């Protein structure tokens, strides 16, 4: 009843925590900052009013 | 009315009983007294405003 107690082990519980997305992860190469895209809008055609 | 009564057999029926948790049986070495266990607390990344 006079000894300081003892610790026998620790185990370092760790979990790995995935992403659920990285098939979305494509890789640019760190140059430039502005990127953009664009579309053409629709044009409904018109009747032939020959007058 | 003068003969000793005859036993025929004694059976001793017996079956052993399992554990249903015997795959949890981890075996340590019986040293020390206490055992603690700990994880790392999280730390989210930060934006860096390099000004």
From TrEMBL, chains A, B:
Organism expressing this protein natively: Staphylococcus phage P68
Part of the full-length chain shown: 52 to 102 of 408
Protein name listed in UniProt: Major head protein
């Amino acid at each position: 009843k006079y000894l300081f107690p003892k610790i026998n082990e620790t185990l370092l519980i760790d979990i790995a925590l995935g992403n659920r997305f990285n098939w979305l992860a494509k890789e640019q190469d760190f140059i430039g900052q502005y990127s953009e895209e664009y579309v053409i809008m629709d044009t409904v055609p018109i009747n032939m009013d020959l007058s």
